Amino acid sequence: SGFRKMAFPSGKVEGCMVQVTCGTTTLNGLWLDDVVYCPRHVICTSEDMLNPNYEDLLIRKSNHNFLVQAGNVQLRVIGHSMQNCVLKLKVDTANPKTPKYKFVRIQPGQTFSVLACYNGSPSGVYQCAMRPNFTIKGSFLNGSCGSVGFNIDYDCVSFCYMHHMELPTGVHAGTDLEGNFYGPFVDRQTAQAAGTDTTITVNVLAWLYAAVINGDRWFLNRFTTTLNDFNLVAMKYNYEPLTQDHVDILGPLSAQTGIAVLDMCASLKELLQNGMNGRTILGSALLEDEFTPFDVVRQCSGVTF
């Protein structure tokens, strides 16, 4: 029993964290094989952040200008290239701790673990979701840039995020491991604001299924709804539309608990219109939306990595 926000074990990712210092900027890098990946804004200082022609700035940097430190060992950079908003520093030593890995771009609603680092030193691990507005509600301080988001499938680490910046509302913006930003954000000093966020409906339903598995049933009702009628209600309460894909994905949970997806939808529909009435679901007074259907199945069935 019990339901917690659980991150993937971070060991395989910790063995890849290095410190990248270029000029005055010191952030984290991801050392995989003989390449260190890190945000391209590391080559930026005063004017280089406001007007950043990154091809021009990078061409002025020599290999020795990048100080890469893996623990107490200094790595020597033998090349540098840029792929979108990520800098790739070729090094002379392949990381012996490189796990089996992939670079994946995740979609809004998908969850991942973040290993927050400062000075190439992992300080914490947390589970979060890619918001529908493409920001991550993270916990990051100055120096966390380069910290990565990951998932683990079997023995494969899927890298899905690299932290680049903090938006004025305290939320975070970053890129996949190919340097492509999530959302309409840029890595330059300009006025950027996160769009109005929405609730990840499929994840709220997955979390309601997890509550039923854990014995929390007060919110269940005798009613069901059409997907069209539920979506009308979801639009009204800033909830993401629920697609037929989402309904299919919730299938195993619907089978395990005996509550059809559209039946759970009518419970969610009531919760939105009537509130919790001073009651909690899994120790929370709000509807949690950062557990995907796969996370609920993984946690309530015990899949190991």
Add this chain to the structure above:
Amino acid sequence: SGFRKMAFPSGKVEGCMVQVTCGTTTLNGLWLDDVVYCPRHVICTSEDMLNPNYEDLLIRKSNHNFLVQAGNVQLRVIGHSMQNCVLKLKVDTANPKTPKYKFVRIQPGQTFSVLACYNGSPSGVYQCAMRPNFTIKGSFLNGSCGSVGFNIDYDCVSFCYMHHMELPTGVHAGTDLEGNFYGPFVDRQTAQAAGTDTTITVNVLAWLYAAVINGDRWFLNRFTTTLNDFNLVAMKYNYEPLTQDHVDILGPLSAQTGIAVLDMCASLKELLQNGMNGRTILGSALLEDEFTPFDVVRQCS
């Protein structure tokens, strides 16, 4: 900016997880140096669960009855001893991945990360606090026994918990790494119930200071209170009494935010009286009590 429930990176603990099989029971073990630590109930049978004599059961065990598996390698047990509710299996190989570590017993309200394992294989890492009733609100399934709770001190791992059992309410009971249970619990199937839990008041205040550091101020008020008047209100909401130690511990946060502890106490009293009025504090509609004053300073500063 931002405030999240953050667990310690689990890498140093993952390198210590092994599978311990004894008869039909299979649980997790913690391999540190040449010793594997695990709940002593791995030696228990069906007939020896209600009232097991562990000294008598372990004396009947031989080293070859314990199957220890570190990944794909089978470890050879060269000795066995028992320290309270923990079994210590001496092995012929010292764990090369053994980090700098300490065994620490923690107090209620203290937080730690849990690395949940199944079959000596880490499946997830989460954060939690030792409840005032000495249980942990965990997320554990069958096979998670031997999963450990830890905190990382720079390069040192302080092991503070080993999962032993699930109580009838879904909450969890375990021991420190010296086998001493937290709470009035025993490793027998006898009727055991967790006492009525209380809210960790010092942790809620630390979390309110974290909200102020993050720019959340709606809950602040012009009031202050005496420590005793705060305790009379707090106890009525099943909140732990706030001691002078707790007030001292919140000192740095009081200095950083300019809000005296007894001033924040009055904000908490108001919050307990009024509720949240459909507002959130750090993205939560309930008062969070699983962030200690130390966690808030570490995460924010």
